[PDB]
Design a protein around this nucleic acid. Structure first.
Ligand SMILES: [K+]
Ligand SMILES: [K+]
Length: 1338
RNA sequence: CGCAUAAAGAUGAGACGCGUUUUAGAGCUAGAAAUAGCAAGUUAAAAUAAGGCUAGUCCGUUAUCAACUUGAAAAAGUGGCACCGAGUCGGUGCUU
DNA sequence: CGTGATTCCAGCGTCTCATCTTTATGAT
DNA sequence: ATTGGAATCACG
């Protein structure tokens, strides 16, 4: 019945747990051992850590599922096209589609001729010579008027449908207009035709180059405006240019229409809004817009076509043919020049696929960029390659037709080519004439994002509802699918239930009931004071209703002056009015009401009580649907109430956002006695004038009981389902779940006695490609040429100094100069907010400067002079997204207030008190699971106090009192951090009960200027220290009030050092059955290997290739009989099989038949043992091996290095220096100098451990030789290399490390034969309960 | 108190472009062959987790998972204490 | 001629839309 | 980046 406490450190890859007593001692208990081994009881300390792999997200799974859906839908598209052509093709070529379907098979497996298109070699060769590429055939079919073979027509249509281009552009793109300059001149002429007072003159400006430039859209607009004399970016011409290029312009200011009238041409609603804009100004202006529309295409098409469109109606096919012709010409010229200049390289360029030459560019794995990088030095070191070099710099040398950059092709181009082909060939083939709409729909059909998968209740990701129970095709999609209901469900399935009534859905944020609720909430909280009042009083119901009718329904916002004058002075005739409890401007307002009043021009319609649900439906319809058609079809049922103009005005209006309260709570539930709702009480509460919080905090009112009863099961979820509801990374959710499970197990271990306290801390927790994307966007938006100066690699940009240099355009960010790319390691990286105020080391709070002294004073924000100097550059960086809003706000804080003492004190406080929501959720879960007993008067009995700590407290405790931590030594540091968390939390809640509200989960009212808080929180951990800065403290600390020994410096520190020096710590790696992909996604070429996995049942890997490297879900220990020799005699073998992910379901269906098929016979089902990954085996001398897979092992022992060695390593390695004053820093340096021999000792330790467990003889000899080689190196470098050295003895998968210049590879244990005779250990989640099975006895 | 913005992240849906694999695009000449020289090279079909049944324009890489017993499953149950110590836990006394 | 040491290799870019939470800035 | 699969390679 001894009282104890639990300490926990939560991480994404570890959960450390510890049990402490009143003395802060870690108990040790004898735990029973199950199994067939002679061992029956083992002594174990109640401290350890659970290790597991990081919890993966579902992004990869979602992407692969979407890819599967896309592939299935593309195959169906092809099937639809074939079924359209089925009869006519069968009349023309019976087995053409069969040959297409079996084109993948080898000649042996084909049931028809090997030539798919024509079925004979002569016609196939003739076709391939006449049409070298599919685009030649497409252009021929588009342009030629002669009757063509149906097979070629189908091939062109299938090539268009299968690869149909993106749908990011809505509307119709006419390929006829391509010239940028011509359409720009047309737009200028139209503008001058309508505007004579200030005509636009753009003659002498290279429109093509500027408008089709490779810079950003914003920078293109800025360049054009700069080259336009007397024109503004926000002007009418500037807005037209922005619309044409793609940036959405606001057209209100240009015409003073008082309506935004935003027009984005890519958006489909543009036309409607365009018409709206016309109704505001006139009809002729659209002509200019019309020209602008054309200009838009003139940009986009010019990016992809770059070909004449007057000769042919298929500009894409013409562009691909031009690419093919240029490729042929350049290839011939390059071959001739190479033969005449550098013959010895010719093979390497044109025959060896291994290199990145033309042979590797066509036949090998080399890409266009790799081929260009390989061939540029050759072109430079040659004559007559000027045109080739020009094309290469333009990325237009030997280009393929199917390349990575074809993603910019809109679907309109392919649709136009398809329409042209169908028009050409409809006369000869009647079915093409009849089914032209069908093929166009097949090409153009796209499932709306709000419809989702077309399932029939067998999918967990589907929400669509079907009007009729019939199979869905692209031609009857609009008739079968209930688009409105599906669109509503798309929003409603992902939205939030209100926290009070989980069954009900929340109202839209712009719902009229929501706004009335907020306004009445604010009005009830109004404490008016005027002359003739003995006491301040709240407003009554009638007065509040009159104010709402007069003030809020006639004004968008209500201020105190309007309340005093228009209501108190006009009606109440009181000229003296002082308000209390509210600010000048009321937060709540009737915005939706005013918008509806403007739209419908009627007050009685809005104010009618009986029809307000119609308006609540209106706002819901406007919130739910984004496409205007859905809103139109939903509001067509309301056509009679409004007019056609009113409907057109309502259609454009769109609302966004959802509230936090449901309709049933606000106005559905009623008090039993009164018969009034929450809104009714808000309207007329009486003299009380209770607000919403007091409404849901009133015991007498039935609302509290109704709210409690609605969540009769609370969340109504299991532990796992409750944790899944938390917002955060999946890895941290996995850590939380493991934490809860280990807490339950620890409670079970201690005799079902709940701990007095549970202290918990939680940690704060490719990139290069993100950096490349960010720098590209920023430089393109800014318009700089810094990137072109030096091509920086993805790994090279990882340097923080270089990253800041590139993000700041190479300039010093505080002054007006430019830094040098080669003068690195000289500039300083300084934080905008001092590290004392805010410990942030991210890019958003770091700035590279030539000298930090230019920042001014380092005790505050950068000075006002720096802000005045570089505000323009900071804003320019912000507009380029090189710096974020937070960074810019921190930079310009000096002009807006700088940093006050209160803010600094708050920043100091918020580094000790945990204010993260995820930690609060963990504390709530633990408190709910550890406090199940209720006090009689509706109170929780807090038998277990849940305390939340921050890592800063434990880190300071470690640093100040020589309890140093090195993560490379072993995984004991997790358990040690958990124990230190427990000790610190228990001591803090012992000495300072008043801080429970800050630390213990729950709400407490015990609270007891800026400098007082600053030094109170700064010295909240100073009662552990013997001396302060030079005041001293007593050896034994006292609680105060009630006398308790919270800390004893003469005893407790020794106990802590003994605990941290304990060799036995329960380090358990969570065994997991591996799940994921079946094998590597890379399809391998055909080879005579048994390790290849067929991609289909009928595709033999020796003839078609396939995947390899399967992922083993779990191994299976099976003893059985195998056939040996020609006689196939039965030999007894006990072996691991390693059931893979692909074979897991087959094995679990029936293991006996699976093992019989694998080759093993007489398998024993009972003796079959399932071993997931990281299964623990003990062999001899304490050597432990974890089962990485069926044929690989991992190190499973830990090096219990003495605490003195860890402290010496931490002191000598200078972790961010020693972070101490010169006195103690010199003392620690002397400690290192006089304890230099510890290094040798540490090496000895490692060596002996390596000889006892690791058994890496070659690596151990190599590392010993390396250590002897660099014995004369400085102590700091030797200590750092020795810290790196511990990777050899680390627990887990072997990894390669580096000792100075020498590198040591990983010694992998690729044999699992030893563990077949070892002792398998099943460890519970804490490792205290173990089951040891001696496998040699099987 | 709330409100605005930004950033980050989670989840879900709809698309695009590649990549990879096999086949098709009779390679020619001198050769007995080994080969040597020369010619050509851009494209397409199919698959893109094996596959499953619920047969859908669906689902298949997330989360969960020591052992034993009771079980569709969710899950439920199973493991004395104190003291001395310490090379991954041992010893002693009490108890069962 | 098995067997330990050594080497190599691993699907990847883009866009549109919606909902949510959390952190960090401020206005008021 | 990582760590298991696969092939290659040196060799006693
Ligand atoms: K998993
Ligand atoms: K386990």
């Amino acid at each position: 019945d001894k009282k104890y406490s639990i300490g926990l450190a939560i991480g994404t890859n570890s959960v450390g747990w510890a049990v402490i007593t009143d003395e802060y001692k870690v108990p040790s208990k004898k735990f029973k051992v199950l199994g067939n081994t002679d061992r029956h009881s083992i002594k174990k300390n109640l401290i350890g850590a659970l290790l597991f792999d990081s919890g993966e997200t579902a992004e990869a799974t979602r992407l692969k599922r979407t890819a599967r859906r896309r592939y299935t839908r593309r195959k169906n598209r092809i099937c639809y096209l074939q079924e359209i052509f089925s009869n006519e093709m069968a009349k023309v070529d019976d087995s053409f589609f069969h040959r297409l379907e079996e084109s993948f098979l080898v000649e042996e497996d084909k049931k028809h001729e090997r030539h798919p298109i024509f079925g004979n070699i002569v016609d196939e060769v003739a076709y391939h010579e006449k049409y070298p590429t599919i685009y030649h055939l497409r252009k021929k079919l588009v342009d030629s008027t002669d009757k063509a073979d149906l097979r070629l027509i189908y091939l062109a249509l299938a090539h268009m449908i299968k690869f149909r281009g993106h749908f990011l552009i809505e509307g119709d793109l006419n390929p006829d207009n391509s010239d940028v300059d011509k359409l720009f001149i047309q737009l200028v002429q139209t503008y001058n035709q309508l505007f004579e007072e200030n005509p636009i003159n753009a003659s002498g400006v290279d429109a093509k180059a500027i408008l089709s430039a490779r810079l950003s859209k914003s920078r293109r607009l800025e360049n054009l405006i700069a080259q336009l004399p007397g024109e503004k970016k926000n002007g009418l011409f500037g807005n037209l240019i922005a619309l044409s290029l793609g940036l959405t312009p606001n057209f209100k200011s240009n015409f003073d229409l008082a309506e935004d009238a935003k027009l984005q041409l890519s958006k489909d609603t543009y036309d409607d809004d365009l018409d709206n804009l016309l109704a505001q100004i006139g009809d002729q202006y659209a002509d200019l817009f019309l020209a602008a529309k054309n200009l838009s295409d003139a940009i986009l098409l010019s990016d992809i076509l770059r070909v004449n469109t007057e000769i042919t109606k298929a500009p894409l096919s013409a562009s691909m043919i031009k690419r093919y012709d240029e490729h042929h010409q350049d290839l011939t010229l390059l071959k001739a020049l190479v033969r005449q200049q550098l013959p010895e390289k010719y093979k390497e360029i044109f025959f060896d696929q291994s290199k990145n030459g033309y042979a590797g560019y066509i036949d090998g794995g080399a890409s266009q960029e790799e081929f260009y990088k390989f061939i540029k030095p050759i072109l430079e070191k040659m004559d007559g390659t000027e045109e080739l070099l020009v094309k290469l710099n333009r990325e237009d040398l030997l280009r393929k037709q199917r390349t990575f950059d074809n993603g910019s092709i809109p679907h309109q181009i392919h649709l136009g080519e398809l329409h042209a082909i169908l028009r050409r060939q409809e006369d000869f083939y009647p079915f093409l004439k009849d089914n032209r709409e069908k093929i166009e729909k097949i090409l153009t059909f796209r499932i709306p994002y709000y419809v989702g998968p077309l399932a029939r209740g067998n999918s967990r990701f589907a929400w669509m509802t079907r009007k009729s129970e019939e199979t869905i095709t692209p031609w009857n999609f609009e008739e079968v699918v209930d688009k409105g209901a599906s669109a509503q469900s798309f929003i409603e399935r992902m939205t939030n239930f209100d926290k009070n009534l989980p069954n009900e859905k929340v109202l839209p944020k712009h719902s009229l009931l929501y706004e009335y609720f907020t306004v009445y909430n604010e009005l009830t909280k109004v404490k008016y004071v005027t002359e003739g009042m003995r006491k301040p009083a709240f407003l009554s119901g009638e007065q509040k209703k009159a104010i709402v009718d007069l003030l809020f329904k006639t004004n968008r916002k209500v201020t105190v002056k309007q309340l005093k004058e228009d209501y108190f002075k006009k009606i109440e005739c009181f000229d003296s009015v002082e308000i209390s409890g509210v600010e000048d401007r009321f937060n709540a307002s009737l915005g939706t009401y005013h918008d509806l009043l403007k739209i419908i021009k009627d007050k009685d319609f809005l104010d009618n009580e009986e029809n307000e649900d119609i308006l609540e439906d209106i706002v819901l319809t406007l919130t739910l649907f984004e496409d205007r058609e859905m809103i139109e079809e939903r509001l067509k049922t309301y056509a009679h109430l409004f007019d056609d103009k009113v409907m057109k005005q309502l259609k454009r209006r769109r609302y966004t956002g959802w509230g936090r309260l449901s309709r049933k709570l606000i106005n559905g539930i009623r008090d039993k006695q009164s018969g009034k709702t929450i809104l009714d009480f808000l309207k007329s509460d009486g003299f009380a004038n209770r607000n919403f919080m007091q409404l849901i905090h009133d015991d007498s009112l039935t609302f509290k009981e109704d709210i409690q009863k609605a969540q009769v099961s609370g969340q109504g979820d299991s532990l796992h389902e409750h944790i899944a509801n938390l917002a955060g990374s999946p890895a941290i959710k996995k850590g939380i779940l493991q934490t809860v499970k280990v807490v339950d197990e620890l409670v079970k271990v201690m005799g079902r006695h709940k701990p007095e306290n549970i202290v918990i801390e939680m940690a704060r927790e490719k990139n290069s490609r993100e950096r490349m994307k960010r720098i590209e966007e920023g430089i393109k938006e800014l318009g700089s040429q810094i990137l072109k100066e030096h091509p920086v690699e993805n790994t090279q940009l990882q340097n923080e100094k270089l990253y800041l240099y590139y993000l700041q355009n190479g300039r010093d960010m505080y002054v007006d100069q430019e830094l040098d790319i080669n003068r690195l390691s000289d500039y300083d990286v300084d934080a905008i907010v001092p590290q004392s105020f805010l410990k942030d080391d991210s890019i958003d709070n770091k700035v590279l400067t030539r000298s930090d002294k230019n920042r001014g004073k380092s005790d505050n924000v950068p000075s006002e002079e720096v802000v005045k100097k570089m505000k323009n550059y900071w804003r320019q960086l912000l507009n380029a997204k090189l710096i974020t809003q937070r960074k810019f706000d921190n930079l310009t804080k000096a002009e807006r207030g700088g940093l006050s003492e209160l803010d600094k004190a708050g920043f100091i406080k918020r580094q000790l008190v945990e204010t993260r929501q995820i930690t609060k959720h963990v504390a709530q879960i633990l408190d709910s699971r550890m406090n199940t007993k209720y006090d009689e008067n509706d109170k929780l009995i807090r038998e277990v106090k849940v305390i939340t700590l921050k890592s800063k407290l434990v880190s300071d405790f470690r640093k100040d009192f020589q309890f140093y931590k090195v993560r490379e030594i072993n995984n004991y540091h997790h358990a040690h951090d958990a124990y230190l968390n427990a000790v610190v939390g228990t001591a803090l809640i012992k000495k300072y009960p008043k801080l429970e509200s800050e630390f213990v989960y729950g709400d407490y009212k015990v609270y007891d200027k800026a400098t007082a808080k600053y030094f109170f929180y700064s010295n909240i951990m100073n009662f552990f220290k013997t001396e302060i800065t030079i005041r001293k403290r007593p050896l034994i600390e006292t609680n105060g009030e009630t006398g308790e020994i919270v800390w004893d410096k003469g005893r407790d520190f020794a106990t802590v050092r003994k605990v941290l020096s304990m060799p036995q710590v329960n380090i358990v790696k969570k065994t997991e059955v591996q799940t994921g992909g079946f094998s590597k996604e890379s399809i391998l070429p055909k080879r005579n290997s048994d390790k290849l996995i067929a991609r289909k049942k009928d595709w033999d890997p020796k003839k078609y290739g396939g995947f390899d490297s399967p992922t083993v879900a779990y191994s299976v220990l099976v003893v059985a009989k195998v056939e040996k020799g020609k006689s196939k005699k039965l030999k007894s073998v006990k072996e691991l099989l390693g059931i893979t992910i692909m074979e897991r379901s087959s094995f679990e269906k029936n293991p006996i038949d699976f093992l019989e098929a694998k080759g093993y016979k007489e398998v024993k089902k009972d003796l079959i043992i399932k071993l997931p990954k990281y299964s623990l085996f003990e062999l001899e001398n304490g050597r432990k091996r974890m089962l990485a897979s069926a044929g690989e092992l991992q190190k499973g022992n830990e090096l219990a290095l003495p605490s003195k060695y860890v402290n010496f390593l931490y002191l000598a390695s200078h972790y961010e220096k020693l972070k101490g004053s010169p006195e103690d820093n010199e003392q620690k340096q002397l400690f290192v100098e006089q304890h230099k021999h510890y290094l040798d000792e540490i090496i000895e330790q490692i060596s002996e451990f390596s000889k006892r467990v690791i058994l890496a003889d070659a690596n151990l000899d190599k590392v010993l030789s390396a250590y002897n080689k660099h014995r004369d190196k400085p102590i700091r470098e030797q200590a750092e290399n020795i810290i790196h050295l511990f990777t050899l003895t680390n627990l887990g998968a072997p990894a390669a490390f580096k000792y100075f210049d020498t590198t040591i590879d990983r010694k992998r244990y690729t044999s699992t034969k030893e563990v077949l005779d070892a002792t398998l250990i099943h460890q519970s989640i804490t490792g205290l309960y173990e089951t040891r099975i001696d496998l040699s006895q099987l």
